Swiss-Prot record, chains A, B, C, D, E, F, G, H, I, J:
Pfam family of the protein (one): Proteasome
Source organism (scientific name): Archaeoglobus fulgidus (strain ATCC 49558 / DSM 4304 / JCM 9628 / NBRC 100126 / VC-16)
Protein name: Proteasome subunit beta
Lineage of the organism: Archaea, Methanobacteriati, Methanobacteriota, Archaeoglobi, Archaeoglobales
Free-text activity regulation comment from the record: The formation of the proteasomal ATPase PAN-20S proteasome complex, via the docking of the C-termini of PAN into the intersubunit pockets in the alpha-rings, triggers opening of the gate for substrate entry. Interconversion between the open-gate and close-gate conformations leads to a dynamic regulation of the 20S proteasome proteolysis activity.
CC per GO annotation: cytoplasm; proteasome core complex, beta-subunit complex
Record-level GO BP terms: proteasomal protein catabolic process
Keywords from the named record: Autocatalytic cleavage, Cytoplasm, Hydrolase, Protease, Proteasome, Threonine protease, Zymogen
Family designation: Belongs to the peptidase T1B family.
Biological role: Component of the proteasome core, a large protease complex with broad specificity involved in protein degradation.
Gene: psmB
Length: 202, 202, 202, 202, 202, 202, 202, 202, 202, 202
């Protein structure tokens, strides 16, 4: 699995590989790795399923409660920070997941990355993180324009992953992409995303 | 020892492979892998017999408590979230077991297979699960439909676990079935498979 | 070391090996690897001597309490689940014993063998705790009939441990066999049993 | 891989199970395990398959050489002790396989077991040998009669290994047997043996 | 690292991978693992290309020389048995690599598998060697009849090795197929292989 | 440091060494590996020096306490079980020691061997704990009879310890024998018993 | 594995305790440890059945060679020192074996012991060699005389190996004795010895 | 590092060495290993320097606490018991010390050996607790008389440490000796003692 | 393992240890351990036992070869220096033995110690290689004087090693001593030596 | 172990430890490690004892042979090279010894150190070699002049050796000073040396 994330000029597009194989073993098939934290905030994870899944339940909760309490829609920066405390604190049992929490909020768009040993770093506009991590970064930076939209970003998302599939045998062949265009929370689902890269040739 | 799981339009089918070994301590072909969580929901278990049965008794209790407490039928979503959280607390009490908790519920039909590290895998499609996962995945994908007869899902499952008996000449024999159609618990039994081969001269 | 218990059509038969060694010295020849939990409920133990002797007091006390408390001789199932619960709570330093709890009760008979981390396997028959259990199981399986007298089961049981014992040096010399016939708990004692192996060989 | 060898009144019955280096999974339907050393001399082997074939040829060439050179058929003791000297010399090359040479000669019939790190001891009529050997030998001595014919001997031989197949997962499916009836040099071949093992339930 | 074969009624068909799989890397952009031993004889290797190609040139060189001395072609059987010897020398000088030698000869056609630990097995018509050899074997039995021609046998060679490159994609491109109809000694070349696998897409 | 114990018909004899050695390091010149738990109940220990000495005050003091509270002497059985609870608790940190607790009581004469992970079995025979066990058990068991006296057992103990002693410098010196003659507690003293073995020395 | 030996006043007698090492099997009902070296000389050997046979054959042949060239019989001492050079020098076939080569010679009657590291000593009495030596010595050296006959020494040999087996439940079974009285070379068979062992325990 | 503590008939004499070494360093010219616990009581130490001096502070005070609280003199058994309970409790936290606590009080004279494992009891005379201990023990036991005065005894003490000095150089350049006569507490000091044995060199 | 060695005024006396354990059997059963090189020459060994037995055979025969060849008796100096060369050649196998070689020659009386790799050193007083050496050197000086008898010597030598029995893991009573006085080569052996340690108490 | 070497106007003086202690082993208290190579050449060795002597013998032998073949006395230079070459050619038989060769020759005075791994370096007029080396250099240079004579030189040598041996627990006594004045070869030996450091007292 690999994950990438792009900061866009009308939203946030982020992508995960929802299918992972390691050899002829299917580590993940339709495995949950795309999560809705809040109405325009999403969590994408590359790494292990088991840390991903449990952590994803609590993050989602703490956002929901945040709007209930304070009557403000949570910013990415709040729920990222909260989550970093946990990853530091509970380090008595190790994690091995890289989180990308991003989305849309009222202040603007910022994407943060939480690491398996904690902390939070602001992504200026690019990341590629996971086992496909380097194959993926290059393509992003070569076609990065600061006028990147959701339309330029969805396609930029597929192609970087598509290179990772074909340069790794630790990647799957069942890509998911998630678009947040600030009018939708659309999740294209594995089939639709895959279909677009299969008229390239493989 | 392997477990499959399949979602049918008119219920859910799951199936088990028995035979227990604990080193050189050996057990007969009667050791359970099938636990009725709820009246129309089962847990098929693979991995460690010790760890599987101690958790079988906790989940059974949680389902009955829930059914009373909230005045409704159990649900696959309810229990899967509990079990996943359950394993994280008792990770310090390590239970090595691969579950599939699924059935028929008042929110539809589904299975969430729970990993021993508190993961959860979306299932409505194909999941293996077990140490015959590679062999199981072969048969289940070859013939599948979302509109699969419950008689065709027992049939598919028993051949998928026949492929595992090919690898396993002592680590697993015997075949039990969970049929859930919302009316009938049925069991294929070791016999049905053995008797074909008795007729066979090859 | 291996013990057997098997369900008869007029009770339950249990067998225990007698005489054990630690280092290069005899340490037991008058120690008991058969426990009376109630008059007509037995426990046989295969494994380390100190684990099995200590754990036996704890089942017993519970079993005495149950009669006092509930007005009732405890079912086999009820006393197995107690056993399982102790090994799970004290898994930091675990007990190295494989437990065999079979007897006769108000609700019939059953046998549950409890694994060394808690989790009990309901086995009806063809059950031996032990690591000598491979060799014993083979004889026990051929000649068991779902309808088998007490007289017969003690004869079958004796051969099972005599075959095992030649390939071990941990079962000791002298073989005990016990008959629970539902009106007595008769323990033949090593003396009489040794003389069945004069219809065999040594 | 585990073997048996019976000295019969109307020949010798030597036995092998199908195993093959190909990822530790049987090669074709028929996999080399029976080597015609000479007209009235056969080789069967428990242990390593590649070792089994390579050492088969050295003995075969020298056996054929013996017959050719001296104008006098070889004897079973001659081929047996020939094997030992060869093994112990050629130990500088990695080897470790337990060898049964047997057949018929003009001193009678006999089976000599050759150890890789020892000589050729005579073995009268009963020999075991393998990692399935405890299982195979147990039933072998019970249904021995030294008065056993080739027909009864083929059954015995197939059954003993079939039992040993059920306690390890290191023995693949299918049994070959070798008959030297003193005039013909038969290999019944996979098709025909399958029927002698499908009089049972498998 | 995997190879496949099927003996055909009018040829010998074998297929190899053109790019050794490091699991995340490849040897070079073009690479050869299908070697010509003679006009009607190829050799296809699994394991290191470095080791394999050295032994193949030695075996070629002696194949030409043997043919010249006799004025008549050597049999495929002789090539394999000479390889069993060659690898026995280089067992006292270790190499780990698995070879298959097949072709056409005067005595008919076959494929012989020659192992670093010695010996050679005549494979009747189904063959692989490697580690993903088991999935490839399975598929090779599916459409196999002795009524299969060369042109269908190349199609099926693709299907068999695609099994191990079905859930990988960094060596899903680059494949060899070798056929030998007795008119031709043809090696398809990636481009012709890509139009066959174009129909399976990936 | 080696200690032996055996039930006599008329009391219990226990023989000790009263010098303390851990191989070829001398711990103390003099030591008392005899502890009086009550008036006629006594304990010998073998294993760690540090543990034997320490443990010994604690056991005596609860035994005196049982006397005071109930105006009635603790049975040997009650001391041995109570000791098994305390070792159990102290098995969580290194506490390997073997205890022999016995004496005279109303329920007969008896010795219990107490294990470090708890559980106390009852030898009405012979038991020997220490490094000298093997040699001691050789002489002790030859002239053992259930009708043995305390006056013959004193003789028998002297011979059995002497074997360990003259052949090894890994054994303690200075044999002292302690006779529980039931109306007394007789301690022969180091001096007297050396002179019983002084029949090869002047 | 232990070999014992005692010297008679008009012969030499020796016994073995058999044990074949694979850790999976014990073969001792058709193999032996006693190989005749000269016509009235034998070698008893401890280790494995196979190690003994290969090792012994050499020594046989060289005993015959020397007999023929001198035109007079080789003494026990001569063969003993010969074996001692074999073992030290040619451990390019490495051996780990303990040997007794004893018998009747013109210059007396004797049992020589030869170590795996060579050097030949001479017990004109009791010897052992093995691990079971200490267990054997109890009955073996108590009833030893310088006037032990050949008839009394085959009896005594049985008691010492049966003492060695007494510690086991029954394991290591395989008793062969040799009688060397110059008027006979009796090389026993299991059966034959079994009836003398049937006068100490039927 | 060795320490002696021995009974006089009017006093107790206990002695110490001085100078601490690494075997390549003079770590300290003088290290404290002689304490007054009470006036008439000493603790002298063999083993680690650091644990020894920290441990002497606690005991010196809780010995004073016994004078203060109980208004009676501290007895050797009372200080020795109470030390032992602490070490035993705190054995997990770093300790590796051998304490000799002796002197004269109303109980009498007795010396107690206390292990950092636990320990407790008692030597009538002569102890070491050291590592020149073995050569120390020879001379001590040779010249020991039970009427040994304090003049005779200090000379003996000095010689025992001198046996250590020759074994391992660390007692050289300073030996300290204490005489306790139950009217004085005199400390000889290093110099005074050293100059007796330095006068052998001129 | 330890040797002692002393030069007398008119002889030489050396002695060795015996009746310990070697491998796992009692070592002295009738063993040689002081080897006769020449009439007025011996070798005693501390180290590997069976290496010394074998090596003894080589140097006795070369001592006879020097005497037969050069018409001039072997000097003490000669035989030690030859050993040096032999020990160098065998520096790869277990062969590490520290040997003292003594006797009388025309140079006068001497004992040479030879280091494991070779290396002779004249000592005309006392010597002791061994782990028993420091303890030996102690006992030796107390009544060793420049002039001593050859029957006052056998007492001292016997003493020293008996004090070393306690400093060594094992060793018994009855050891080898040899006196070589230019008038006798008398080897006492356990029976005679036992009586000389019967004045030396326990 | 340590050696020092100084160049005088008329001599070379070097010094060795003449007693080696490691644990409780003393190789002999008369043990030579001062080797005379030629008439006015010496060698003083630090490092392992046995390898010092064995290599040293060979160089004495060499000094003579060169001396005879060239007809002229050896260079200091000659033998320093010679040793280094021998050592380098014999690293399959490694001698783990640090040499110092010096003496007087026609070139004059010099001392070479030869590494245990071969190679000859030259030292101007001071040298220390071994583990005592750091302290020894400054101790030696204090009273150094090149014109310092032999009489002050042997005194000056003791102080370096003396410092190293007194902190060390590995030495404490036993030192040889070698004087080579172009007229004498004195070996001072431990006793005479003793009063040189009895001046510097404790």
């Amino acid at each position: 699995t690999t994950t990438v994330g792009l900061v866009c000029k009308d939203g946030v597009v982020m992508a995960t590989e929802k299918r992972a194989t390691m050899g002829n073993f299917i580590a993940s098939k339709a495995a949950k790795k795309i999560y809705q934290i809040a109405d325009r905030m999403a969590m994408t994870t590359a790494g292990s399923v088991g840390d991903a899944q449990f952590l994803a339940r609590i993050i989602k909760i703490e956002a929901n409660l945040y709007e209930i309490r304070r009557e403000r829609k949570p910013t990415v920066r709040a729920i990222a920070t909260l989550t970093s405390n946990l990853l530091n604190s509970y380090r008595y049992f190790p994690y091995l997941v890289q989180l990308l929490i991003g989305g849309i909020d009222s202040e603007g768009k910022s994407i943060y990355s939480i690491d398996p040993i904690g902390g939070a770093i602001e992504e200026k506009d690019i990341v590629a993180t996971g086992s496909g991590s380097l194959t993926a970064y290059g393509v992003l930076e070569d076609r990065f324009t600061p006028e990147i939209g959701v339309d330029e970003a969805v396609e930029l998302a597929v192609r970087a992953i598509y290179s990772a599939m074909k340069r790794d045998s630790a990647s799957g062949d069942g890509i998911d992409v998630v678009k947040i265009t600030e009018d939708e929370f659309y999740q294209y689902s594995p089939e639709e995303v895959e279909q677009i890269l299969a008229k390239f040739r493989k």
